[PDB]
Amino acid sequence: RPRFSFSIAAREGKARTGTIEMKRGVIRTPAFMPVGTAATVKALKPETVRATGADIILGNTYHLMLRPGAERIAKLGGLHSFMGWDRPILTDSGGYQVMSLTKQSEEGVTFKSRHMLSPERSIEIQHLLGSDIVMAFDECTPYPATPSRAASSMERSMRWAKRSRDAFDSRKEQAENAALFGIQQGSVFENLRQQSADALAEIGFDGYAVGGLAVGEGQDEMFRVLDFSVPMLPDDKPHYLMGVGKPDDIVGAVERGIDMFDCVLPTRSGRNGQAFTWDGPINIRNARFSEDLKPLDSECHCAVCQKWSRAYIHHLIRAGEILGAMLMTEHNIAFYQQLMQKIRDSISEGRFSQFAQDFRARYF
Amino acid sequence: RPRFSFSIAAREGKARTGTIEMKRGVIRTPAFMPVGTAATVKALKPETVRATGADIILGNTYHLMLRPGAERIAKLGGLHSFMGWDRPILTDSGGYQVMSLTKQSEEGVTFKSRHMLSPERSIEIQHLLGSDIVMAFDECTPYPATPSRAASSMERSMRWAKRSRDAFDSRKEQAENAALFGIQQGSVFENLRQQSADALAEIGFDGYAVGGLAVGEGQDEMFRVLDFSVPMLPDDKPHYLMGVGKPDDIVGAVERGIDMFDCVLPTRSGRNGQAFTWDGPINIRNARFSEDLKPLDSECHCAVCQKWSRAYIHHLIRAGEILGAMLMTEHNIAFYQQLMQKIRDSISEGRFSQFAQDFRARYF
Numbered sequence: 018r019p020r021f022s023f024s025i026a027a028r029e030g031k032a033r034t035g036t037i038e039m040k041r042g043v044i045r046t047p048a049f050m051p052v053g054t055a056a057t058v059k060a061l062k063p064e065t066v067r068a069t070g071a072d073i074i075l076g077n078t079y080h081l082m083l084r085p086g087a088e089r090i091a092k093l094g095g096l097h098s099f100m101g102w103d104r105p106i107l108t109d110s111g112g113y114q115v116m117s118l119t120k121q122s123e124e125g126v127t128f129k130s131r132h133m134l135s136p137e138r139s140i141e142i143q144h145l146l147g148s149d150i151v152m153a154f155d156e157c158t159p160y161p162a163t164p165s166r167a168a169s170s171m172e173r174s175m176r177w178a179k180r181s182r183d184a185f186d187s188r189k190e191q192a193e194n195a196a197l198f199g200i201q202q203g204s205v206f207e208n209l210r211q212q213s214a215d216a217l218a219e220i221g222f223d224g225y226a227v228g229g230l231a232v233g234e235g236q237d238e239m240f241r242v243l244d245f246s247v248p249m250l251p252d253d254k255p256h257y258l259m260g261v262g263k264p265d266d267i268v269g270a271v272e273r274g275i276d277m278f279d280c281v282l283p284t285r286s287g288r289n290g291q292a293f294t295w296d297g298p299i300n301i302r303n304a305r306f307s308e309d310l311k312p313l314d315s316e317c318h319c320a321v322c323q324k325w326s327r328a329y330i331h332h333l334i335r336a337g338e339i340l341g342a343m344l345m346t347e348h349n350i351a352f353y354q355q356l357m358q359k360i361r362d363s364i365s366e367g368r369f370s371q372f373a374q375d376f377r378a379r380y381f
Numbered sequence: 382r383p384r385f386s387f388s389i390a391a392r393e394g395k396a397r398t399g400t401i402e403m404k405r406g407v408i409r410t411p412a413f414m415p416v417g418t419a420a421t422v423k424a425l426k427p428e429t430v431r432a433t434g435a436d437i438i439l440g441n442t443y444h445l446m447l448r449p450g451a452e453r454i455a456k457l458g459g460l461h462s463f464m465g466w467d468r469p470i471l472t473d474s475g476g477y478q479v480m481s482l483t484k485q486s487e488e489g490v491t492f493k494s495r496h497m498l499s500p501e502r503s504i505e506i507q508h509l510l511g512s513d514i515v516m517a518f519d520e521c522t523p524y525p526a527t528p529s530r531a532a533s534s535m536e537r538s539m540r541w542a543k544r545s546r547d548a549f550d551s552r553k554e555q556a557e558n559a560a561l562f563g564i565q566q567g568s569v570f571e572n573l574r575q576q577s578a579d580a581l582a583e584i585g586f587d588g589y590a591v592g593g594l595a596v597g598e599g600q601d602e603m604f605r606v607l608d609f610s611v612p613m614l615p616d617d618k619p620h621y622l623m624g625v626g627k628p629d630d631i632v633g634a635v636e637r638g639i640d641m642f643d644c645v646l647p648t649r650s651g652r653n654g655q656a657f658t659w660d661g662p663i664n665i666r667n668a669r670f671s672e673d674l675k676p677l678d679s680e681c682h683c684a685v686c687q688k689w690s691r692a693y694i695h696h697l698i699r700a701g702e703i704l705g706a707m708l709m710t711e712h713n714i715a716f717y718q719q720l721m722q723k724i725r726d727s728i729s730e731g732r733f734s735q736f737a738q739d740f741r742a743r744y745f
């Protein structure tokens with residue numbers, strides 16, 4: 018396999034389906050990337066994550082850089098060996114959680130013990146973790162933002178994107194074996210999104226993320242911004258929407274040209290008792306499920322739905338049992354993978370628009 | 382398979398190895414029975430519990446009778462279907478936790494919402510759960526106890542044992558498909574243990590437990606009491622030591638004629654960071670393990686020891702990750718199963734005394 022190859026096998030409107038080939042494996046697009054901790058996903062073994070159909074996971078750089086430490090993980094053989102996940106891993110730059118979870122400067126961000134995270138350190142940390150897809154270090158502009166603040170922020174991010182590029186390229190091992198994605202900013206403003214797209218393509222990346230969304234604007238506004246923003250990115254490279262989202266968000270985003278997604282929702286939801294189904298989410302804690310012998314979802318192919326009832330999982334979750342978290346998480350991640358499979362196959366067959374419509378009608 | 386058949390295949394001194402055949406499967410003795418919740422074991426899938434080598438699990442009657450309720454579990458198809466464990470389950474009578482975790486009378490025990498647990502209700506609850514091995518309802522005498530209190534308590538327990546027997550036998554389905562064990566009491570007093578053994582054998586049970594130990598007396602005293610107490614039980618029936626114990630306790634108990642064990646230690650320990658090894662327990666939280674790439678135990682055949690390092694599990698546990706609980710629990714239950722396998726094979730081969738000595742020398 019090559020370091021990085023994206024191939025589009027089929028199209029429908031702005032939607033695309035294909036594959037990313039990397040040294041550690043192939044990624045089917047549109048892709049959902051489960052988000053971890055030190056665990057590939059909370060409460061799942063790597064073999065379980067794979068079994069649900071994931072081709073790639075998102076490594077939680079912010080968590081790992083604090084404990085156990087990136088240097089330590091490198092000393093131990095890198096994140097893949099540590100975790101026991103031998104397929105691709107995309108690492109976040111760690112800035113979103115830093116700024117979310119502090120003193121900003123052109124150098125980077127200082128945060129509390131106290132540390133500085135700059136584009137160079139971020140790229141270095143991702144290298145130490147042994148990331149396959151490295152994210153440039155950026156600033157996710159708060160929402161709402163005035164045009165001036167949005168432009169200032171975006172401009173800084175583009176300068177950081179160039180620093181990210183140069184840091185990546187100066188490291189031979191990383192440059193030859195990993196890929197680097199740039200992230201578009203500009204809040205909700207068409208002109209700033211265009212400037213950002215142009216700056217990133219001038220620098221040149223292996224893939225392009227749409228940043229700065231799913232930060233409070235709501236689905237209509239996010240879709241409006243995606244409508245003009247994704248066509249500004251190079252068509253022949255993958256498009257990654259960061260931090261999205263609910264099933265309906267993912268479908269509408271694919272309709273707008275997005276190829277890759279990450280979100281904590283299936284795990285967070287699941288730990289909290291929310292299960293995804295083709296008829297909408299359900300909250301398994303509700304008394305209505307205490308004697309319901311049906312699986313979480315009637316059609317789901319996951320091991321959980323093959324083996325246990327709603328009634329059992331209802332009891333586990335109300336009792337605070339770890340096994341309830343395990344089973345809910347496996348189901349919800351499997352559900353997300355089945356959604357992505359359905360999306361890929363429908364695009365491949367030229368019937369994605371009908372799938373999107375049937376999906377929504379039933380889900381809502 | 383028969384309802385219940387115990388066969389002794391080999392002996393060494395007072396130690397025995399054999400099998401219990403039941404309708405839902407065969408149990409290799411000496412046996413360790415992992416203890417659950419609504420989960421066969423906390424943080425494990427039933428398939429994982431089986432994979433570690435368990436032939437039978439202990440159903441936590443006290444927990445289940447409160448939530449979700451025995452009637453509900455019966456409505457849902459019984460505990461085996463609810464949990465997804467299709468092999469034998471031994472259920473506790475629920476009194477130990479009631480008295481541990483209240484107003485005592487000849488009828489039973491009342492406890493807080495408020496309820497009464499009597500021998501008849503206990504047998505009924507175990508029936509509703511669909512237990513394969515039913516325990517008589519008894520009183521675990523506190524330690525220390527004066528001879529008069531020990532005798533009073535023991536006498537009551539023997540009366541409850543007869544009520545337990547009659548309640549079990551009056552229920553046709555239970556009598557034909559499950560087994561019933563009686564429990565010996567008498568604190569540390571030889572004469573009361575003998576009276577208890579005699580009362581139980583006069584009633585007649587499928588197996589006999591040694592109750593009233595591992596309640597604060599310490600290993601020397603427990604072994605002293607086992608020395609005279611186990612030979613009082615029928616030789617041709619299984620001997621169950623309730624609530625024991627650490628690996629060293631199990632070995633010494635088998636040397637004294639015990640065939641079956643239950644304890645929460647491998648799960649509790651494991652969730653707390655204690656891993657069992659052939660060189661003794663280790664606490665994986667200790668800084669000494671933060672960069673140790675060896676498995677939890679050098680010889681262990683479990684999936685955890687095949688796949689992850691001490692260093693990784695150290696991080697998981699310190700981070701409070703569910704996956705750390707999962708992995709520690711799987712290892713410790715596997716460790717207990719491997720100990721029991723080593724015990725069975727050494728008895729079978731006539732070298733249990735040498736195994737007991739090598740085990741202790743290395744473990745301590």
Ligand SMILES: CNc1nc2cc3c(=O)[nH]cnc3c(CCNCC3CCCC3)c2[nH]1
Nearest residue numbers: 077109113157228229230231232259260279
């Ligand atoms: C939910 N909305 C959301 N919006 C986001 C915008 C951005 C951006 O503009 N740049 C970078 N990252 C962004 C992120 C982070 C995406 N997930 C990172 C995971 C790693 C471990 C835990 C989370 C966003 N998330």
Ligand SMILES: CNc1nc2cc3c(=O)[nH]cnc3c(CCNCC3CCCC3)c2[nH]1
Nearest residue numbers: 441473477521592593594595596623624643
């Ligand atoms: C640790 N010492 C100990 N000593 C015990 C004496 C007795 C007795 O004399 N009779 C009955 N049960 C007894 C028990 C209970 C044995 N485990 C039951 C499990 C079900 C779910 C959680 C625990 C004892 N445990």
Ligand SMILES: [Zn+2]
Nearest residue numbers: 317319322348
């Ligand atoms: Zn499912």
Ligand SMILES: [Zn+2]
Nearest residue numbers: 681683686712
């Ligand atoms: Zn192990």
